[PDB]
Write a protein that binds this DNA or RNA. Structure first.
Ligand SMILES: [Zn+2]
Ligand SMILES: [Zn+2]
Lengths: 182, 182
RNA sequence: CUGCCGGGU
RNA sequence: UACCCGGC
């Protein structure tokens, strides 16, 4: 159920440029659903598969759970790659049909942020009740704590690794800010 | 004994970061020897060998050329990569023993220039009657015109290529000047 | 695909 | 993930 600590470090790695050994930074999504009646959170994670994308895999998962439409839920997502233009649309739709869910999205990296469609896509999310932010130490902290297996001994220092995501996320944050006001 | 236009273009490319497709930018030397009386120049080019770098296979084979010790010669070298710390030591040793030769070096790119032993080697040449400069539009012009065959039709426009070479050499020149000041 | 740090689109 | 650029 739990991501391996090496999967976390490699896949959430928001570095400017990769360090050797090189590896594909795959899409990955960490969601957590909290009811607002004072209740227990539910968690899981998705990759890209079949005819999906992790966001689309997660939209249909919610539908499966058959939630309580009389209840507001807080839905938080942690994406290594900020969403598609196409997934942007499919998410804006989804949230419009499910007003009883409060969606918030955090990206570790901004996917093709120099292209207009991905730009418009993110401005839309932020215009259509779906705030988009860059993960910072708070979000990197919560994702490590609750989504990563901590039973085995690590080949690296977790606190320094988190330190470095925090540091790298700053320039990624100013870039997202500039996109919103364009 | 004429480089092909594709070899010149690939090997003397001074872009900081390459473009696809990727290829090894290997060491290469184009040399010109001219006397001070008037006699026409002598030209050739050298590659890295297993037992000598281009600069060193070159100064070696000078004994085996039809020059005499009573005339002065101006020796100009055009290098893709700037000299070794090891080659720097041997170039100064060689110039010191041959007072009939006036050598000056021109590098397209600075080889490992963030490293002290390579920088001291460049400082050493400049301080030992061996001027080191970064190749500019004149030197790129010079080397294209005299050292590569212009029979075949080119798959690219040599004017725009030299234009970018000239544009790229500006930052690299600024880097050599800083090194020469430490 | 010489290495590193950093800014911006 | 692409490009432009600065410095070491
Ligand atoms: Zn998508
Ligand atoms: Zn050498």
């Amino acid at each position: 159920a739990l991501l391996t600590a090496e999967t976390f470090r490699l896949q959430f790695n928001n570095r400017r440029r990769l360090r050797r050994p090189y590896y594909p930074r795959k899409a990955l999504l960490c969601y957590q659903l909290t009811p607002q009646n004072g209740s227990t959170p539910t968690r899981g994670y998705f990759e890209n598969k079949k005819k999906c994308h992790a966001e689309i895999c997660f939209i249909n998962e919610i539908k499966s759970m058959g939630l309580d439409e009389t209840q507001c839920y807080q839905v938080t997502c942690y994406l290594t790659w900020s969403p598609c233009s196409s997934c942007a649309w499919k998410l804006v739709d989804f949230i419009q049909a499910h007003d009883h869910l409060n969606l918030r999205i955090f990206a570790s990296r901004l996917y093709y942020h120099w292209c207009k469609p991905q730009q418009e896509g993110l401005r839309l999310l932020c215009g259509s009740q779906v705030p988009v932010e860059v993960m910072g130490l708070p979000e990197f902290n919560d994702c490590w704590e609750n989504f990563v297996d901590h039973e085995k001994p690590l080949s690296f220092d977790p606190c320094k690794m988190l330190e470095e995501l925090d540091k790298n996320s700053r320039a990624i944050k100013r870039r997202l800010e500039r996109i919103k006001q364009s």
